[PDB]
């Protein structure tokens, strides 16, 4: 099987950390005893020294390869990187062949200790431009209600975190949803039918749906104060209703891995939320879900509770056997061992954090999508920017009826403009594929003149001039 091009590059590099000679070393200069030996990239002591709170899963893959492959014979190639299962094997390899009549300890799911995950799949989410997500908050500034979107992007290496993958996003697509002041809830059938055609155009453009965003602002008084502070240390970090939508999105998009026995493991999916800081701004934060316990129990046992920090655990009806969930908390006198014989266990423990950021404006490798970021989006029907062909006379117009190719190609690289053109499918699919590849790639000057000489682009500007 074949993995991603980014995932195979992190596997080949060892990522060792070099050290220097010290006063504690008693050996010679041409050697190393223990104090200047090469440090492994999975040691968590070096991680918390530089305030890195997770061990960068590609290095966690290396720390399990040392346990799988040894100096001894072995002759196995097991590679035990699989999803730990809480479901019940029906055959059970014993005399209690039905679960209605019989269950023993080798098939019973053990009591969940609630230990936090030490490794994250995505180590650092990054963005492309501050003007891209400024249009997303501007949707709230016009209708006053919450929004929703899906992030399309790619992946590359990250040199800050040892053996880490960074998440790059390029554009944000919004599905048609019904907004509300308190929260939001849309139909999953019309979104999945709409997201199927966007994945078609994302393949030729080199994009993949790897993220989503949802807003939560609660403006205070619209004067000096920006927003309220809903999510803090004493309150919930992520609501339990949005854990369900984050869990189903990770199971729909698996990550291919040759080390896993099933063929897919350790999904690379980000969930970002606009919530605001403690003091005064609308700074965002992102956390992703845990694979070890939460990713498998969401198929059978997650039920909604009235508290945003916790989630209710329901009962067993003849196939849905669940084990007891335990966690430690302080009582009125001291700190005690596991107490939970009670439902509504918290879900903030099962989240691992990420580091969001925006790159510097002075230099970058590329940006690939900065045309205007002011074009009316596809499914923004709550706002007034959902126009017909009247907008195409205002937006591009083949500027001033005779456009220069340095000023014409800079507008054609928009994500939602190219996704609006092919829906009319005036051009051929072969000429459309070279149209979107010219706008997204470099050395575009020889191929842009091929587009203007084609009869399909001439019919597009002729059918636009007669219409309003």
């Amino acid at each position: 099987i074949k993995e991603l091009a980014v995932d195979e590059e992190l596997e080949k590099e060892d990522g060792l950390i070099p050290r220097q000679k010290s006063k504690l070393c008693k050996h010679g200069d041409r050697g190393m005893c223990e104090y200047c030996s090469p440090l492994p990239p999975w040691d968590k002591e070096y991680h918390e020294k530089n305030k890195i709170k997770h061990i960068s899963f590609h290095s966690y893959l290396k720390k399990l390869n040392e346990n799988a492959n040894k100096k001894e014979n072995g002759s196995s190639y097991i590679s035990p990187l699989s999803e730990p299962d809480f479901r019940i094997n029906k055959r059970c390899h014993n005399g209690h062949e039905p679960w209605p009549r019989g269950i023993c300890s080798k098939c019973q799911p053990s009591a969940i200790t609630l230990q936090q995950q030490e490794f994250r799949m995505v180590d650092h989410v990054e963005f492309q431009k501050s003007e891209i997500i400024n249009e997303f908050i501007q949707a709230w500034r016009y209708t006053g209600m919450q929004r929703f979107g899906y992030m399309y992007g790619s992946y590359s290496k990250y040199d800050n975190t040892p053996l880490g993958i960074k998440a790059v996003v390029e554009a944000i697509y919004e599905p048609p949803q019904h907004d509300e002041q308190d929260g939001l809830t849309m139909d999953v059938e019309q979104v999945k039918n709409e997201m199927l055609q966007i994945d078609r155009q994302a393949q030729e453009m080199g994009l993949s749906r790897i993220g989503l965003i949802f807003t939560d602002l609660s403006d205070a008084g619209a004067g000096d104060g920006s927003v309220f502070c809903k999510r803090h240390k004493d309150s919930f970090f992520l609501s339990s209703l949005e854990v369900i939508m984050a869990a189903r999105h990770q199971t729909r998009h698996p990550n291919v891995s040759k080390y896993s026995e099933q063929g897919f493991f350790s999904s690379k999916f980000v969930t970002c939320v606009i919530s605001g800081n403690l003091e005064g701004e609308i700074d965002i934060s992102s956390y992703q879900v845990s694979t070890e316990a939460e990713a498998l129990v969401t198929a059978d046992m997650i039920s909604g509770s009235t508290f945003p920090s916790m989630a209710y655990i329901n009962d067993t009806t003849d196939e849905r056997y669940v084990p007891e969930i335990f966690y430690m908390k302080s009582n009125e006198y001291g700190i005690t061992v596991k107490e939970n014989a009670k439902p509504a266990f918290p879900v903030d423990y099962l989240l691992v954090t990420l580091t969001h950021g925006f790159p510097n404006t002075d230099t970058e490798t590329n940006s690939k999508f900065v045309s205007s970021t002011g074009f009316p989006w596809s499914n923004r029907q709550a706002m007034g920017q959902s126009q017909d062909y009247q907008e195409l006379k205002k937006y591009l117009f083949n500027v001033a009826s005779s456009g220069d190719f340095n000023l014409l190609h800079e507008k054609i690289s928009n994500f939602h403009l190219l996704l609006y053109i092919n829906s009319l499918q005036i051009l051929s699919p072969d000429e459309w594929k070279l149209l979107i590849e010219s706008a997204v790639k470099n050395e575009w000057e020889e191929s842009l003149l091929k587009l203007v000489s084609s009869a399909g682009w001439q019919t597009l500007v002729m059918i636009l001039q007669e219409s309003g």
Partner: protein
């Protein structure tokens, strides 16, 4: 008599409105079924925004026509 109000998520809401009442009573009837205040509500009739102070006869809205519902706060 019959009317059809449809949101952006592809969900049509059935409602029985009088042929000679105001648009504000239509916004009050959709308030009771869901719990949305009618101040931020707006009704689009084939690209034309219905004014709440008028009636159903001057806009020539016929029986069981497809309507649109959108929410937009004035200050927000």
């Amino acid at each position: 008599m019959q009317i059809f109000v449809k949101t952006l998520t592809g969900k049509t809401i059935t409602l029985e409105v009088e042929s000679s009442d105001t648009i504000d009573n239509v916004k009050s009837k959709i308030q009771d079924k869901e719990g949305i205040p009618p101040d931020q509500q707006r009704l689009i009739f084939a690209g034309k925004q219905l004014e709440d102070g008028r009636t159903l006869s001057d806009y020539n809205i016929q029986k069981e026509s497809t309507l649109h519902l959108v929410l937009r706060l004035r200050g927000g």
